[PDB]
Design a protein around this ligand. Structure first.
Ligand SMILES: Nc1ncnc2c1ncn2[C@@H]1O[C@H](COP(=O)(O)O)[C@@H](O)[C@H]1O
Ligand SMILES: Nc1ncnc2c1ncn2[C@@H]1O[C@H](COP(=O)(O)O)[C@@H](O)[C@H]1O
Ligand code: MOO
Ligand code: MOO
Ligand SMILES: [Mg+2]
Ligand SMILES: [Mg+2]
Lengths: 419, 419
């Protein structure tokens, strides 16, 4: 009944569907994937523009003293004026080139003469120098952005260039989160009573979903009572969320009602994965009453297993729903800074702190990994500062320091601390 | 008057000061750097906890049939009951181990006997098996998080474990943004008049600052009038922001008032950097009237130069103000997928799309880079999809395909599209 992670991932990918596109404002489009192509309605620059502060000249005139017949910085400056041979115009960078001028001489290659305005051009320039012709940066009707492209700051800049302030994008999924267990108390609890622990998974998962830029619906702690969990799941399913995340209540306990309830409400595709940590992971698809599908992840209760399963299975599902064409995490190859013993049955997602070094140990640059120590699934300190999961195959052998392994990068690579 | 980028960066680092710490709620602490150590007020688990669903036994009893004297899942279950030799207790994962039991036998190694409750233990277990002793995951008073540590989802989980819902952190800086130019129109403009372009830098910088998780104060378009820009800068300086970003008005134009105004209001440390793109970058420190310092970046107007300067100089300043101990960007080494001509004077921050390959061209894994094409500073399409800036030294020689270069990673490495 235990499936490999690669098959569990394929199943999730095959069930997960891109959400219907929506229209958002400019700053709401940041971080989203475009659901339409964007075409420039006019060229950039829309007028021949100076690259420099200086003088617009007729290049064939060459060096000499000339009257300054207009000044062109913006708008209608120099409208109706023709720079004829034997004249020049002052220009600032981005200023429209007056008719008749065919090159710009930067101010450093000129000198103002006299105490009316006259200037000495100190060089022989070439036709077209320091002029941006109409549309040289962006041609009118060119496609500046395409469908399936994620919007970052430069793409916001291109949308603003093209005058697009309402954008068609794929939305982020809305995610409901709950915790299960009679042992749980809220994390505001002070002195714990006997047999109680603070609910850490819910806040951890709320934060994890906030890092994925999705809206969170926090459904709180649910006790180990089948009727109660059914009511919360029925309410989560009908609320309009796209994903439901539960943690706990999915092992072999006599009060673990997540799996049987997901079996009753929808289709469970799997409930056990061959992996360390994260064995009791359940995945289901539930149809909400009319009109849409809801994906449910019955995450394991052990804090480490909970976050690892979120990182490996939930993040790519969020990205797929959000229209990402490349939802898979970044996988790199790296060298171990210390020896690690692999398990003989379950492949391990071993937590590590990775960094780029000029010498990775082999004499050339590369990533290196330090284990976070003891990997027990109950030990959330093993996730502390972990920016990667080393994919250790189930060989049972000690992988020595300096051996090469594959690693899944789980936290912003541009936020990596340097060596 | 033109300083190397490394010196411009050192100056910015030496002037930039970490902001005073603040107290925020749990979910507000996400993405922030801790400004206090966090100690566990109680152990995890606070009671001896079962690792499995099954039966708590006296290990020395060994295999046999035994009465089930209590059931322990949470809270006060089994309080006052002693598991004596010849008895067992039912336990669920995370359930408190009753007094007297010293090992757990998972339910798969047991069988319920009879139609009162009796169970057959099918194995010989060892003392301490499948029990988490008090504090084995986290010891009472252990430091679970330290000052200078950035808070991600696992660190939120550790704060919730320790019952911390109000956290001392370094805040993010508040950033004011404005654009300058008589040629600019709002990006809502439809048909452009002569000599007008849409303001793209402001939205681009607003988005860039939003990606850095800072609050934005949008000060709009300012015209090329010294008195007007002075009023907006005086108002930005006195508003409570920590950083002011302007773009444009910093080249050699006769109406470029950013540098002289920053010289008049504060201390300009530099106004020209030896780099391609981004030559006219100005940096100043202004004291606000009582009581604090404001950092001002006079960013270049050319869209590419504007974003590149933001990425290289502003991002690490934001991170330093926000208490990051490693504010520098991730720098990797990679192989070029195509030839690139380097400039003979100015070192270039060449935009590229980088990806990790199993074969980088040299036969071993590594990053490879594709140029985004023409690198003119007016061409914002050169930033499109650019996740890195290749640091090309000023040699004037053609760096062929397959040569190794240093690259600054500018966009989330965990958001990288795979090969
Ligand atoms: N929300 C939670 N936060 C912290 N630990 C949890 C949470 N839910 C379950 N656990 C623990 O995870 C383990 C497995 O839980 P379960 O799958 O409900 O048996 C037990 O040790 C639970 O006490
Ligand atoms: N906000 C803006 N958005 C787009 N282009 C700009 C902006 N500000 C300045 N520019 C252009 O950048 C170049 C340099 O501007 P400046 O430094 O003001 O001379 C000129 O081509 C300007 O038209
Ligand atoms: O059963 Mo696990 O893989 O320790 O959550
Ligand atoms: O003067 Mo630049 O380096 O094209 O902004
Ligand atoms: Mg439970
Ligand atoms: Mg200007």
């Amino acid at each position: 009944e235990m499936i490999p992670t690669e098959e569990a991932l394929r199943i999730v990918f095959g069930v997960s569907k891109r959400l219907p596109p929506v229209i958002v404002s400019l700053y709401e489009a940041l971080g989203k994937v475009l659901a339409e192509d964007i075409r420039a309605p006019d060229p950039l620059p829309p007028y021949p523009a100076s690259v420099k502060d200086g003088y617009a000249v007729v290049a064939s005139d060459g060096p000499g003293e000339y009257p300054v017949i207009t000044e062109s910085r913006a708008g209608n400056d120099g409208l109706g004026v023709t720079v004829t041979p034997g004249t020049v115009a002052y220009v600032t960078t981005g200023g429209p080139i007056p008719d008749g001028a065919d090159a710009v001489v930067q101010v450093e290659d000129t000198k103002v003469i006299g105490d009316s305005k006259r200037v000495k051009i100190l060089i022989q320039t070439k036709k077209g120098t320091d002029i941006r012709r109409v549309g040289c940066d962006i041609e009118k009707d060119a496609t500046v952005l395409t469908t399936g492209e994620r919007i970052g700051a430069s793409e916001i800049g291109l949308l603003a260039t093209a005058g697009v302030t309402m954008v068609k994008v794929y939305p982020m999924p809305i995610v409901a989160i709950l915790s299960t267990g009679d042992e749980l108390v809220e994390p505001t609890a002070g002195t714990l009573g006997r047999g109680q622990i603070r609910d850490s998974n819910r806040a951890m998962l709320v934060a994890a979903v906030m890092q994925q830029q999705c809206k969170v619906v926090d459904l709180g702690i649910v006790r180990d009572d089948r009727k109660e969990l059914e009511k919360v799941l029925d309410e989560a399913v009908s609320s309009g969320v796209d994903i439901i995340l539960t943690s706990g209540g999915v092992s072999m306990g006599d009060r673990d009602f997540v799996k049987p309830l997901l079996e009753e409400k929808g289709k469970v595709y799997f409930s056990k994965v061959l992996m360390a940590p994260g064995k009791p992971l359940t995945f289901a698809e539930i149809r909400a009453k009319p009109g849409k599908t809801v994906l449910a992840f019955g995450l394991p209760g052990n804090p480490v297993s909970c976050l690892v399963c979120f990182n490996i299975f939930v993040v790519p599902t969020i990205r797929q729903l959000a229209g990402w064409t490349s939802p898979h995490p970044l996988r790199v190859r790296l060298r171990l800074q210390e020896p690690i013993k692999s398990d003989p049955i379950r492949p391990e997602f071993h937590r590590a702190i990775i960094k780029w070094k000029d010498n990775d140990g082999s004499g050339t640059p590369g990533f290196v990994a330090e284990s976070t120590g003891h990997q027990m699934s109950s030990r959330l300190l093993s996730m502390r500062s972990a920016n990667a999961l080393l994919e250790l195959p189930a060989t049972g052998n000690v992988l020595s320091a300096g051996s090469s392994v594959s690693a899944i990068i789980v936290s912003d690579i541009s936020a990596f601390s340097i060596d």
